[PDB]
Design a binder for this molecule. Structure first.
Ligand SMILES: CC[C@H](C)CN(C[C@@H](O)[C@H](Cc1ccccc1)NC(=O)OCCNC(=O)C(Cl)Cl)S(=O)(=O)c1ccc(OC)cc1
Lengths: 99, 99
């Protein structure tokens, strides 16, 4: 599909058995999801943007479906204000920018 | 062009007559540039990101050439980690996401 940018590019994702709305975010290196109690091992990480850094939990090889396209990779979980799909998964679903 | 996402979508922009590198950032509503001088009046504003809020200078109706495409719109100037081109200008240059 083609998604214009008049509004926030929010799509439905499926992860850890939950459906959520998330931003398709070309500005994000990594994928960052709102706090959720995922099972498995994780590693601490800090990620930074406007305002400063937040503490997140890094989970690897997590299956995630984005707008009906399957992907699997690293997901960062913590107190982000919005669910963010980053380039690590955008590449997996063949997402490009076009103008 | 069509831009894939294995690397950061960095492009050259021209603004206030000077060249800079900036990130095409679909997760950003607004365009935020690192501290710089721009001509004309500005308004004090605040803007949010993943780590909290920052103070910015809002410049309206500013021309900016982004990877060879003209836009004229609002530019926020402040302590962003990276120059980011947000949706307000991505729409002007006809940018969409495709997968
Ligand atoms: C300063 C941008 C920075 C280079 C990347 N950011 C991704 C942006 O697209 C960010 C997404 C976001 C949107 C809304 C709330 C929180 C994060 N957007 C952003 O910072 O917009 C800045 C101006 N704000 C606005 O336009 C509105 Cl949406 Cl508040 S991010 O969320 O901080 C981020 C995401 C992933 C990541 O992995 C390393 C590291 C940082």
């Amino acid at each position: 599909p083609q998604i214009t940018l008049w509004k926030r590019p929010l799509v439905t994702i499926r992860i850890g058995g939950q459906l959520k709305e998330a931003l398709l975010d070309t500005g994000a290196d990594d994928t960052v999801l709102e706090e959720m109690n995922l099972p498995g091992k994780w590693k601490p990480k800090m990620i930074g943007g406007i305002g400063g850094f937040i503490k997140v939990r890094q989970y690897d090889q997590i299956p995630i479906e984005i707008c009906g396209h399957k992907a699997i990779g690293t997901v960062l979980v913590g107190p982000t204000p919005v669910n963010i799909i980053g380039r690590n998964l955008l590449t997996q679903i063949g997402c490009t920018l076009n103008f």
